[PDB]
Design a protein around this motif. Structure first.
Motif, PDB file in Angstrom:
ATOM      1  N   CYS A   1     -10.368  -0.184  -5.516  1.00  0.00           N
ATOM      2  CA  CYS A   1      -9.555  -0.097  -4.305  1.00  0.00           C
ATOM      3  C   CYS A   1      -8.816   1.232  -4.251  1.00  0.00           C
ATOM      4  O   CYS A   1      -8.606   1.892  -5.274  1.00  0.00           O
ATOM      5  CB  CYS A   1      -8.517  -1.233  -4.235  1.00  0.00           C
ATOM      6  SG  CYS A   1      -7.862  -1.614  -2.541  1.00  0.00           S
TER       7      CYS A   1
ATOM      8  N   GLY B   1       0.821  -1.189   0.000  1.00  0.00           N
ATOM      9  CA  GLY B   1       0.000   0.000   0.000  1.00  0.00           C
ATOM     10  C   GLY B   1       0.862   1.248   0.000  1.00  0.00           C
ATOM     11  O   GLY B   1       2.066   1.211  -0.259  1.00  0.00           O
TER      12      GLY B   1
ATOM     13  N   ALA C   1      -7.413 -10.122   3.086  1.00  0.00           N
ATOM     14  CA  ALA C   1      -6.297  -9.226   2.824  1.00  0.00           C
ATOM     15  C   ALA C   1      -6.231  -8.179   3.927  1.00  0.00           C
ATOM     16  O   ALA C   1      -7.266  -7.715   4.414  1.00  0.00           O
ATOM     17  CB  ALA C   1      -6.442  -8.545   1.463  1.00  0.00           C
TER      18      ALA C   1
ATOM     19  N   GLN D   1      -9.832  -6.496   4.524  1.00  0.00           N
ATOM     20  CA  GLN D   1     -10.710  -6.421   3.363  1.00  0.00           C
ATOM     21  C   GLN D   1     -10.783  -7.800   2.709  1.00  0.00           C
ATOM     22  O   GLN D   1      -9.973  -8.687   2.998  1.00  0.00           O
ATOM     23  CB  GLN D   1     -10.204  -5.351   2.372  1.00  0.00           C
ATOM     24  CG  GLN D   1      -9.895  -3.985   3.027  1.00  0.00           C
ATOM     25  CD  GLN D   1      -9.576  -2.867   2.047  1.00  0.00           C
ATOM     26  OE1 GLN D   1      -8.411  -2.538   1.819  1.00  0.00           O
ATOM     27  NE2 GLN D   1     -10.615  -2.254   1.491  1.00  0.00           N
ATOM     28  N   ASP D   2     -11.736  -7.957   1.784  1.00  0.00           N
ATOM     29  CA  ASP D   2     -11.881  -9.210   1.050  1.00  0.00           C
ATOM     30  C   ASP D   2     -10.581  -9.575   0.343  1.00  0.00           C
ATOM     31  O   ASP D   2      -9.884  -8.710  -0.194  1.00  0.00           O
ATOM     32  CB  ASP D   2     -13.006  -9.103   0.010  1.00  0.00           C
ATOM     33  CG  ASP D   2     -14.373  -8.890   0.633  1.00  0.00           C
ATOM     34  OD1 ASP D   2     -14.539  -9.189   1.835  1.00  0.00           O
ATOM     35  OD2 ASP D   2     -15.285  -8.433  -0.090  1.00  0.00           O
TER      36      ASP D   2
ATOM     37  N   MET E   1      -8.803 -10.947  -2.743  1.00  0.00           N
ATOM     38  CA  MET E   1      -9.036 -11.135  -4.162  1.00  0.00           C
ATOM     39  C   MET E   1      -7.901 -11.978  -4.742  1.00  0.00           C
ATOM     40  O   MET E   1      -6.952 -12.343  -4.043  1.00  0.00           O
ATOM     41  CB  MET E   1      -9.172  -9.770  -4.840  1.00  0.00           C
ATOM     42  CG  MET E   1     -10.241  -8.920  -4.171  1.00  0.00           C
ATOM     43  SD  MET E   1     -11.925  -9.432  -4.550  1.00  0.00           S
ATOM     44  CE  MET E   1     -12.110  -8.727  -6.187  1.00  0.00           C
TER      45      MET E   1
ATOM     46  N   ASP F   1      -4.616  -8.230  -9.227  1.00  0.00           N
ATOM     47  CA  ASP F   1      -4.996  -6.893  -9.653  1.00  0.00           C
ATOM     48  C   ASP F   1      -4.814  -6.796 -11.161  1.00  0.00           C
ATOM     49  O   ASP F   1      -4.141  -7.627 -11.776  1.00  0.00           O
ATOM     50  CB  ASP F   1      -4.177  -5.812  -8.939  1.00  0.00           C
ATOM     51  CG  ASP F   1      -2.693  -5.912  -9.235  1.00  0.00           C
ATOM     52  OD1 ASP F   1      -2.268  -5.413 -10.298  1.00  0.00           O
ATOM     53  OD2 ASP F   1      -1.952  -6.470  -8.398  1.00  0.00           O
TER      54      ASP F   1
HETATM   55  C1  LIG Z   1      -5.596  -4.380   0.773  1.00  0.00           C
HETATM   56  C2  LIG Z   1      -6.007  -3.948  -0.617  1.00  0.00           C
HETATM   57  C3  LIG Z   1      -5.344  -2.652  -1.047  1.00  0.00           C
HETATM   58  C4  LIG Z   1      -5.894  -2.105  -2.359  1.00  0.00           C
HETATM   59  C5  LIG Z   1      -4.952  -1.400  -3.326  1.00  0.00           C
HETATM   60  F1  LIG Z   1      -5.603  -0.275  -3.864  1.00  0.00           F
HETATM   61  C6  LIG Z   1      -3.513  -1.053  -3.027  1.00  0.00           C
HETATM   62  O1  LIG Z   1      -3.139  -0.759  -1.936  1.00  0.00           O
HETATM   63  C7  LIG Z   1      -2.562  -1.059  -4.217  1.00  0.00           C
HETATM   64  O2  LIG Z   1      -1.227  -0.802  -3.842  1.00  0.00           O
HETATM   65  C8  LIG Z   1      -2.700  -2.452  -4.839  1.00  0.00           C
HETATM   66  O3  LIG Z   1      -2.040  -2.484  -6.113  1.00  0.00           O
HETATM   67  C9  LIG Z   1      -2.090  -3.499  -3.918  1.00  0.00           C
HETATM   68  C10 LIG Z   1      -2.673  -4.862  -4.130  1.00  0.00           C
HETATM   69  C11 LIG Z   1      -3.458  -5.464  -3.252  1.00  0.00           C
HETATM   70  C12 LIG Z   1      -4.188  -6.753  -3.345  1.00  0.00           C
HETATM   71  C13 LIG Z   1      -3.670  -7.718  -4.207  1.00  0.00           C
HETATM   72  C14 LIG Z   1      -4.295  -8.948  -4.361  1.00  0.00           C
HETATM   73  O4  LIG Z   1      -3.755  -9.882  -5.200  1.00  0.00           O
HETATM   74  C15 LIG Z   1      -5.460  -9.241  -3.684  1.00  0.00           C
HETATM   75  C16 LIG Z   1      -6.010  -8.299  -2.834  1.00  0.00           C
HETATM   76  O5  LIG Z   1      -7.153  -8.630  -2.187  1.00  0.00           O
HETATM   77  C17 LIG Z   1      -5.400  -7.033  -2.637  1.00  0.00           C
HETATM   78  C18 LIG Z   1      -6.087  -6.117  -1.687  1.00  0.00           C
HETATM   79  O6  LIG Z   1      -7.062  -6.434  -1.053  1.00  0.00           O
HETATM   80  O7  LIG Z   1      -5.519  -4.917  -1.598  1.00  0.00           O
END
Ligand SMILES: C[C@H]1CC[C@@H](F)C(=O)[C@@H](O)[C@@H](O)C/C=C/c2cc(O)cc(O)c2C(=O)O1
Length: 348
Positions: free
Chosen positions: A156, A24, A42, A95-96, A98, A101
């Protein structure tokens, strides 16, 4: 506390068996097993409290996501922090979980036209809800779009979001930085603060083009290079569109350029669905006032298999003004983050 790559990641005992999955803005993202709900989740670590701007971005996202509820926006299931302000050094948002991305996915997977159509529908469906709440995301890009194993899509990161303010959007030439570069609308570099909804539509158009070819359509090498790439494909702006730019520095920059022809979309994307390129053109329109709006995009023929306004919900309680955060010192912001996360404490 459990540790990850030489860093505290203090989420137990509810959340165990941790794996690093990404980053993040103010900390790492891990997957973990939720021992109550018996599913993996996550978790994002946030460490904002030493800097005013970080606290602003953290508080803004928490306030937005605790009010939003939408299938194409990833919500907050839990927030973990210390029981007192003195002991609170970090905050963890659960959070859920996934599968991937869209940035990672586009690195190695070609998308069928059916996937492109479904992905775009879900982006716009979530965006309709965001904009109906009078909110701008302002940093839409592939890495901020999450997908599960059956290709459900969720938006997100609302850390850069703002309440829309179209009447105060005008500014000067080469002063604004809103969004990530490749997804930044041309008016950001010319005369816009990024306070109107059309800023998000431009980013979605850039994402659509990137889904069609697996490469960014406007890959500027640095800030100043970005407008070179946009104009190289869209061509020179019309007289009418130039007359909408009253700022003289911006307008005279554009007038100083040699003529550039438009590059036809079907020459750039010879495999693409013609309806997709028609919608792409309307999203990547130079003049932000002529640019398609989110509810028009949903009704475009490319999306006809999915379009259903009764199943495209809007927000119950729009945000009326930006949360009044600037000049607020980080100490008051920490207190506000503490109060905003109190609902998740064991107790209450
Ligand atoms: C906790 C949230 C954050 C959402 C996001 F906006 C970020 O912070 C960016 O940096 C992303 O590029 C990082 C990727 C996250 C991510 C990857 C997955 O393979 C499965 C997932 O569930 C997540 C997730 O939940 O990310």
């Amino acid at each position: 506390p459990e540790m990850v790559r030489g860093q505290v990641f203090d989420v137990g005992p509810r959340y165990t068996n941790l794996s690093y999955i990404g980053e993040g803005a103010y900390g790492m993202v891990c997957s973990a097993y939720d021992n109550l709900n018996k599913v993996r989740v996550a978790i994002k670590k946030i460490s904002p409290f030493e800097h005013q701007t970080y606290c602003q971005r953290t508080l803004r996202e928490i306030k937005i996501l605790l009010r939003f509820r939408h299938e194409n926006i990833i919500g907050i299931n839990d927030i973990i922090r210390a029981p007192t302000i003195e002991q609170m050094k970090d905050v963890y948002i659960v959070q859920d979980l996934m599968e991937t991305d869209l940035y990672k996915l586009l690195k190695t997977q070609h998308l069928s036209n059916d996937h492109i159509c479904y992905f775009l529908y879900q982006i716009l469906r979530g965006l309709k809800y965001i904009h109906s709440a009078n909110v701008l995301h302002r940093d839409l890009k592939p890495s901020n779009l999450l997908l599960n194993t059956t290709c459900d899509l969720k938006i997100c990161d609302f850390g850069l979001a703002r309440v829309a303010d179209p009447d105060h959007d005008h500014t000067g030439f080469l002063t604004e930085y809103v969004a990530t570069r490749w997804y930044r609308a041309p008016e950001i570099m010319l005369n816009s603060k990024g306070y109107t909804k059309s800023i998000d539509i431009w980013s979605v158009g850039c994402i659509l083009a990137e889904m069609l070819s697996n490469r960014p359509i406007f890959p500027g090498k640095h800030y100043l290079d970005q407008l070179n790439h946009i104009l190289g494909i869209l061509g020179s702006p019309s007289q009418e569109d130039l007359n909408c730019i009253i700022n003289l520095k911006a307008r005279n920059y554009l007038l100083s350029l040699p003529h550039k022809n438009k590059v036809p979309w079907n020459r750039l994307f010879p495999n693409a669905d013609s309806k997709a390129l028609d919608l792409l053109d309307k999203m990547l329109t130079f003049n932000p006032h002529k640019r398609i709006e989110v509810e028009q995009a949903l009704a475009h023929p490319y999306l006809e298999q999915y379009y259903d306004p009764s199943d495209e919900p809007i927000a119950e309680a729009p945000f009326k003004f930006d949360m009044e955060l600037d000049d607020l010192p980080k100490e008051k912001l920490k207190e506000l983050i503490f109060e905003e996360t109190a609902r998740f404490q064991p107790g209450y």
